[PDB]
Structure 1
Amino acid sequence: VPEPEVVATPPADAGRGLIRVDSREIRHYSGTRKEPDYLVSRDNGKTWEMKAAPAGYPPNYGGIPKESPAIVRNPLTREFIRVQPIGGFVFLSRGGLDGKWLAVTNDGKLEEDWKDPEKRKNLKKLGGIMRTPVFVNKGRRVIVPFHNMGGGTKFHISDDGGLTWHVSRNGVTSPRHEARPPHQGVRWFNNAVEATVLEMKDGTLWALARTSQDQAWQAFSKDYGETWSKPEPSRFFGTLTMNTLGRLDDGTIVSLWTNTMALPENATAGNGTWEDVFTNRDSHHIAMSGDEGKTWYGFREIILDEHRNHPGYATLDGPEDRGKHQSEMVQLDKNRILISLGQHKNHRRLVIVDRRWVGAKTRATQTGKDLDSQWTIHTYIPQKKGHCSYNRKPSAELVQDPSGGTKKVLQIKRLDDPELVNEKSNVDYRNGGATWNFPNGTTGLVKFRFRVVDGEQADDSGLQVSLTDRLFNACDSTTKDYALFTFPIRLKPAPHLLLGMKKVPFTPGAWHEISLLWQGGQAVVSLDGKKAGTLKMANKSPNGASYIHFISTGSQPDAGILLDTVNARVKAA
């Protein structure tokens, strides 16, 4: 099955400006303050180059340098509407992207002569931070989500193709984060911001919005956006990152988001007006639904941030926000989807994904071969750097397999590294760990191979093994508290699995395999092919399991354990 393929770096952060021109030509516009330009492919997304926009295309009067305006085709007129992420004007095309453009005036007319600064004074200016215009109701209405950081999302609405505008009665809101353990402070408050909107088959609109909770929140409209239901949590985990919904030609719904859990807030987190540090933006994910959202499949990692382990992460090539959050998509053919994702020139990417890979039911890995592409292992140096960033270290390293041969395997232990401690913030990220994604399942079988390192161990040394429904940081010792299933491998007094109350011993200094076969609210655990015990589900999930997470448990420096292979198979549902 075809794995995700990086094809280019877009000329702006992802989320706005990716637009199909015709069956073979696709563009990604930019936030340049100079003469406008775009990145273009003429082979349906495979190869790309920069090009200057023609003289009729208006500069970015509003916007910001790192974000393109959103550009959307009106399905009735086949012309385009352009709005910025913030500020500026509403432009409508006549003759397509490379035709004439006109700006919408405050009195519902079109201004052809927007190069005259005096004539720009009476142009319509839509307020707030805006996301993507979406045409709804057989193309007869266009709505543009907009927000205020603490005030919530509402919708700019036009019933005449962008000439005149009104505002929805209400929109989407979400509650402040409450500092309770394991947090030591409050998360940055965003009030249901950055909404993505999809029209459902029954005519309802579904809005999915970014929040300070553990998941995105959602509301629904029965009148094409004028009024919205009470907001509620969605099934899509994630915090303070962006959601994007779309629909393929055959009606399949696509959900793109960053499916992560941030580290718990520290003791210097601030009052929640602004962020202190980002610990959850190093991945992007996809799920799809063929039945109007009743059931979902996939929840697969599109990509991990290539810089995620590095001790210069926060400041390489300028301090601007970086990562793999934010996205926008264009279907390429029956099977393939082009996705722009991420932020910062060193991190943002255009990636082709295949729906047959989204719908796959198996995955396998070997740490020595697959660490750089598939494994999240980073710990953080807890000193804020750049803009709301931490520098990182790999929390685990590859070593020679003690059995001999050429295999390299991953050593997971409690680290002797004082640079991973901040006593004022009260965090200690010295427990190394590792986590790996697989296609989502409410029933499945995962197997992994591990070995105890021959060396000094602490009294609490071992490995906490968890199945989770989003990506928890490798160094997050609270993962078990949120997990679907979890158990410890304990090394003292002698090595054993603890499965409820049952201890199951095994030999140190030898490779062993453990299997977890989960279904509903319980999992069966096997060791070296023999049933060992059972586990009761610790937390329910709206979706199922899509990660296995391993974290060392020693509280003093130890030798730990080695991890070799993992494989997963899930049931179709």
Structure 2
Amino acid sequence: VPEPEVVATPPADAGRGLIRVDSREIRHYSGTRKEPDYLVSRDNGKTWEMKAAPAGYPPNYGGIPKESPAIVRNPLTREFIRVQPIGGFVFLSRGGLDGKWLAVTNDGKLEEDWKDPEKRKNLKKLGGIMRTPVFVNKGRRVIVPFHNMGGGTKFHISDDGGLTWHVSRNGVTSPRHEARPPHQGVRWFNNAVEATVLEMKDGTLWALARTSQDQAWQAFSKDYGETWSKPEPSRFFGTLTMNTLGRLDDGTIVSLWTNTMALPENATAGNGTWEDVFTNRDSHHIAMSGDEGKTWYGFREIILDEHRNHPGYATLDGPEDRGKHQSEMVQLDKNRILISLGQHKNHRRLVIVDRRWVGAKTRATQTGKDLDSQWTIHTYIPQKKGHCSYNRKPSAELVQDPSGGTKKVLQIKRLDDPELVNEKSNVDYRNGGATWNFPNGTTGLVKFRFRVVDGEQADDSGLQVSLTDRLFNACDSTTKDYALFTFPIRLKPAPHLLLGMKKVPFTPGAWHEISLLWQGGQAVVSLDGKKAGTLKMANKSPNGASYIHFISTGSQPDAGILLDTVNARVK
């Protein structure tokens, strides 16, 4: 069963503009300010080329150059509706995407002659930053989520195919972040923004929205979007990144999001009215549910950002926002889904994912072979660069296997690098680390092979090992406080595992295997095939474990430990 496959770079940041035309043709429109165009696949998503749009397709009067308008098919008429991410007009098609297009007027009529500037003055303009129109109530209503500068998500609502519009009575909100430890400042405040909506089988609507909390928040509507329930945390971890929900032909729900935890806010973060830095946008994830969201599986990494370790990350080809957050999906066939994801022309991708891969129960890795594609190891140079970015370094390096032979293995240690410190922001990212994804499970077995490096060690040198339910940065020493299960490997006074107050010795100069067998609220730890002790769950999870996280613990430069293989099996 195939791993995720990159097939192209979309012509706009992801999240809007991907649209199926027929059984073989799929398009991704653009935000171009010039003659409209689109990226097109004519082989159901495998290969792609740019094409100019025909003369009757409207230019982008609103929007912005890096974002396409949203294009959605009306399920009753099979025509299309188009809205921009911001500004511009409401366009409806007659005769398809390459047919005639009409703009909605303020008086509920349709305007054919929209290339006349004077006639554009009386066209309907929907306010706010908009996401994707969705058709609900047996196709008879269309809703467009939007947010303004402060009051949270609300919905533009039309009951006549988009000709006339009103606003929902309420929408979705979420609370402000508080500067409590480990935070030294406030996260940029987003009040339940950038919502995705799904119609559930019982007619209820589910809205899932981006927040300043550790997870997306959600609300539900029983009246097709007019009114919404009290907002609550969702099961999808992530902060200040976008969620997308969709449904496959057979009823299966798909959730796409960036399943990450940002580094704690530092001492120069503002009052929350603006963002200082993004440290959580270098991955994208997928989970699925076959039972209307009662249970979920997957939580797999679709892709890691190829540039994530780079010391020029923030400023290569301009300073604008980049990464793997934002996404849109189109099903290709029973087993395959096409996803557009990310921001910036060097980071944006179109990727094909297989559902059988989402449902897999095992994964294995060797650091020397798989570092580039599978391992998050970057630390940050904590100096603001570009638009809300930091440049990076790899925090851990491959070295020869001390035993001999051809394996390269990962050295995880406390770095001697003053560039990873910012005194005024009061942050220090010199502890190297590494983290790796596997399919989600509430029960599982993970095994890893490690060795103490033969050299000088500090008094607190070692490795904190954590099982987590989202991706924590390699250099984040607070991971243990949020982990499902966690324990330290200590190198001094002599090497040992610490399980509670139990010390379990092991030898230097030799490879060792540790296994973690978890079930419910307990994890059994084994060393070289012998039971070593049992760990109580530190944090409950709505989902289960889907990452193992390793971080050095030394406070002075040390030699650290080597990491070779990791294997996971879940049930």
TM-score tier by shorter-chain length is over 0.9
Q: Which residue in 1 is equivalent to 2:334?
A: 334
Deviation at 1:151, TM superposition (A): 1.4
Deviation at 1:137, TM superposition (A): 1.1
Distance 1:184 1:50 in 2: 47
Q: Which residue in 1 is equivalent to 2:569?
A: 569
1:20 pairs with 2:31: no
Deviation at 1:504, TM superposition (A): 0.4
Distance 2:39 2:419 in 1: 42
Distance 1:152 1:135 in 2: 21
Aligned runs of 1:87-126 on 2, under 5 Å? 87-126=87-126
Distance 2:66 2:118 in 1: 27
Q: Which residue in 2 is equivalent to 1:185?
A: 185
Deviation at 1:149, TM superposition (A): 3.7
Structure 2 counterpart SS, 1:356:
helix
Contact in 2 for aligned 1:149/1:193 (Cα 8 Å): no
Distance 1:394 1:421 in 2: 15
Q: Which residue in 2 is equivalent to 1:38?
A: 38
Distance 1:385 1:87 in 2: 29
Deviations 1:21-73 (A, max 9, x none): 00000000000000000000000000000000000000000000000000000
Deviations 1:350-387 (A, max 9, x none): 00000000000000000000000000000000000000
Q: Which residue in 2 is equivalent to 1:539?
A: 539
Deviation at 1:293, TM superposition (A): 0.3
Distance 2:419 2:118 in 1: 58
Distance 2:556 2:406 in 1: 31
Instruction: Among all aligned residue pairs of Structure 1 and Structure 2, give the percentage whose two residues are the same amino acid.
Output: 100
Contact in 2 for aligned 1:155/1:171 (Cα 8 Å): yes
Contact in 2 for aligned 1:297/1:359 (Cα 8 Å): yes
Deviations 1:510-539 (A, max 9, x none): 000000000000000000011110000000
Contact in 2 for aligned 1:450/1:564 (Cα 8 Å): yes
5+ residue gaps, structure 1, are none
Distance change in 2, residues 1:566/1:149 (3 Å): farther
Structure 2 counterpart SS, 1:517:
strand
Structure 2 counterpart SS, 1:207:
strand
Deviation at 1:245, TM superposition (A): 0.1
Distance 2:411 2:134 in 1: 49
Structure 1 counterpart SS, 2:103:
strand
Distance 2:529 2:90 in 1: 64
Deviation at 1:501, TM superposition (A): 1.2
Distance 1:382 1:220 in 2: 40
Distance 1:247 1:91 in 2: 25
Structure 2 counterpart SS, 1:92:
strand
Deviations 1:72-93 (A, max 9, x none): 0001000000000000000000
Structure 2 counterpart SS, 1:370:
helix
Deviations 1:98-126 (A, max 9, x none): 00000000000000000111100000000
Deviation at 1:422, TM superposition (A): 0.3
Quick check: 141-150 or 296-305, which moved more?
141-150
Aligned runs of 1:110-509 on 2, under 5 Å? 110-509=110-509
Deviations 1:384-434 (A, max 9, x none): 000000000000000000010010000000000000000010000000000
Deviation at 1:150, TM superposition (A): 2.2
Deviations 1:143-186 (A, max 9, x none): 00000242100000001100000000000000000110000000
Distance 2:2 2:326 in 1: 23
Deviations 1:206-237 (A, max 9, x none): 00000000000000000000000000000000
Deviation at 1:470, TM superposition (A): 0.2
Runs of 4+ in structure 1 deviating by more than 3 angstroms, as ranges, are: none
Contact in 2 for aligned 1:150/1:189 (Cα 8 Å): no
Contact in 2 for aligned 1:176/1:189 (Cα 8 Å): yes
Deviations 1:448-467 (A, max 9, x none): 00000000000000000000
Contact in 2 for aligned 1:70/1:84 (Cα 8 Å): yes
Q: Which residue in 2 is equivalent to 1:57?
A: 57
Deviations 1:451-501 (A, max 9, x none): 000000000000000000000000000000000000000000000000111
Deviation at 1:280, TM superposition (A): 0.2
Distance 2:256 2:201 in 1: 20
Distance 1:517 1:540 in 2: 16
Q: CA RMSD in A?
A: 0.4
Deviation at 1:540, TM superposition (A): 0.3
Structure 1 counterpart SS, 2:464:
strand
Distance 2:365 2:180 in 1: 37
Contact in 2 for aligned 1:149/1:189 (Cα 8 Å): no
Contact in 2 for aligned 1:458/1:557 (Cα 8 Å): yes
Distance 2:336 2:82 in 1: 26
Distance 2:529 2:222 in 1: 54
Distance 1:420 1:509 in 2: 30
Structure 2 counterpart SS, 1:373:
helix
Contact in 2 for aligned 1:324/1:348 (Cα 8 Å): yes
Contact in 2 for aligned 1:396/1:433 (Cα 8 Å): yes
Contact in 2 for aligned 1:361/1:569 (Cα 8 Å): yes
Alignment TM-score, normalising by the size of structure 2: 1.00
Distance 2:168 2:148 in 1: 14
Structure 2 counterpart SS, 1:51:
strand
Deviation at 1:271, TM superposition (A): 1.1
Contact in 2 for aligned 1:204/1:221 (Cα 8 Å): yes
Deviation at 1:274, TM superposition (A): 1.0
Quick check: 21-30 or 147-156, which moved more?
147-156
Distance 2:42 2:138 in 1: 30
Deviation at 1:2, TM superposition (A): 1.0
Distance 1:461 1:196 in 2: 45
Contact in 2 for aligned 1:189/1:273 (Cα 8 Å): yes
Distance 2:184 2:150 in 1: 22
Deviations 1:318-367 (A, max 9, x none): 11100000000000000000000000000000000000000000000000
